[PDB]
Ligand binder design. Structure first.
Ligand code: HEM
Length: 399
């Protein structure tokens, strides 16, 4: 059994292993860092099965759970939030914060999302680049999702820049173990204060709603509110930043489609759909342990055995998406759901918000900067470690 996670073939490419597995061994065993084994699912149909099977669990205290790293095993000890819960606990807590993320709520949030993007682009414009290139990530990809989630949670405007920087340190590759944890602990400390404040004087934000609707009635306690808010912050920020960066690099990679997007920003929604399929920036979250024996394909996964379902591989499944390795914003979509945001009960709570942010970004970015260009040969782009989720660390641009 090969060691997993696999390493991406190249900077922007998915691991080479998946294609081969989908064709010759769709359901196989891989070896994890601690030597334990797990079943790796690579076909779209099987990934969907794993994501929805009631015979599988997300509880990490169950023996056999596929932890992919030393730290993962440690994190599994703390009290769990809905991300690691099975029904009915899962929705009992998730429904506590779902209102802000419904399709309707997000549609009503559009103007706010637009102004957040406009202001960041304007500040990046006046800041100019007359003395050289600027980092699109630091100046744009990072603050867009950061300010929005922080604002929705209840963070005041003046604290956004500092908190955005601290949250970045949390996952930054250059950060030392000490720097990462301190930034992490600091964010938790800040959230604790916000909860205390909103418990006293509630405002129109997520933290205040948890405080009034769950904490006060005694449904959850303060630390719970802090952890739930923390999850909403760290769960998808790094991914959002990587998706925006990856989007810009991809458009530079395919000039003709960038030409098309500029000419018709109305194509943004479909460009975002193809981007979330082509670049599956979160491919290691659909994990489970079998509660009882379950047959998947030609294999029998026995009780207490772990399973990793690659939504990244599923998104390149040639049986579902024709010419899967071709990025095409004008792609003819099949009836099957691309899985950039997972599937089933646990499907990304912020899928609609994430798409709205991305759609706003790519329907506006080139309108503001028609001549935006990556200020460095594409083959030299600084991507994330090949053994981690796909993404871009920094992206020098000129406009
Ligand atoms: C383009 C950006 C994003 C992508 C591609 C993405 C993708 C995903 C994926 C693959 C999952 C796993 C779903 C499953 O278990 O089947 C997930 C879960 C989750 N995401 Fe995101 N996400 C994004 C943005 C966000 C944002 C902005 C937030 C926060 C507001 C967020 C919050 C969460 C949470 C809390 C979960 C756990 C849901 C649950 O287990 O019930 N995501 N996301």
């Amino acid at each position: 059994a090969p060691s997993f996670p696999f390493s991406r073939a190249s900077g922007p490419e998915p691991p080479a292993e998946f294609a081969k597995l989908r064709a010759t061994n769709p359901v196989s065993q891989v070896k994890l860092f601690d030597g334990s084994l797990a079943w790796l699912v690579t076909k779209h149909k099987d990934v969907c099965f794993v994501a929805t099977s009631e015979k599988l669990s997300k509880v990490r205290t169950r023996q056999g759970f596929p932890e992919l790293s030393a730290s993962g095993k440690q994190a599994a000890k703390a009290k769990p939030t809905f991300v690691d819960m099975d029904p009915p606990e899962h929705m009992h807590q998730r429904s506590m914060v779902e209102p802000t993320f419904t399709p309707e709520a997000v549609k009503n949030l559009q103007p706010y999302i637009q102004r957040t993007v406009d202001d960041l682009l304007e500040q990046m414009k006046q800041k100019g680049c007359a003395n050289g290139p600027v980092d699109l990530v630091k100046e744009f990809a990072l603050p867009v999702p950061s300010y929005i989630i922080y604002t929705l949670l209840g963070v005041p405007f003046n604290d956004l820049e500092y908190l955005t920087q601290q949250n970045a340190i949390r996952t930054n590759g250059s950060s030392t173990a000490r720097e990462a944890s301190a930034a992490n602990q600091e964010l938790l400390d800040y959230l604790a204060i916000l909860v205390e404040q909103r418990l006293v004087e509630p405002k129109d934000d997520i933290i205040s709603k948890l405080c009034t609707e769950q904490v006060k009635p005694g449904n959850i306690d303060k630390s719970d509110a802090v952890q739930i808010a923390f999850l909403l912050l760290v769960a998808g920020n790094a991914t959002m930043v990587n998706m925006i960066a990856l989007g810009v690099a991809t458009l530079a990679q395919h000039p003709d489609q960038l030409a098309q997007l500029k000419a018709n920003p109305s194509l943004a929604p479909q460009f975002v759909e193809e981007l979330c399929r082509y670049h599956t920036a979160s491919a290691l979250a659909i994990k489970r342990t079998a509660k009882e024996d379950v047959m998947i394909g030609d294999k029998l996964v026995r009780a207490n055995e772990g399973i990793i379902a690659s939504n990244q591989s599923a998104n390149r499944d040639e049986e579902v998406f024709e010419n899967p390795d071709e990025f095409n914003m004008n792609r003819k979509w099949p009836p099957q759901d691309p899985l950039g945001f997972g599937f089933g009960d646990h499907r990304c709570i912020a899928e609609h918000l994430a798409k709205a942010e991305l759609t706003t970004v790519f329907s506006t970015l080139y309108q503001k900067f028609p001549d935006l260009k990556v200020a460095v040969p594409l083959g030299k782009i600084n991507y994330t470690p090949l053994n981690r989720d796909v993404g871009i660390v920094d992206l020098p641009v000129i406009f």
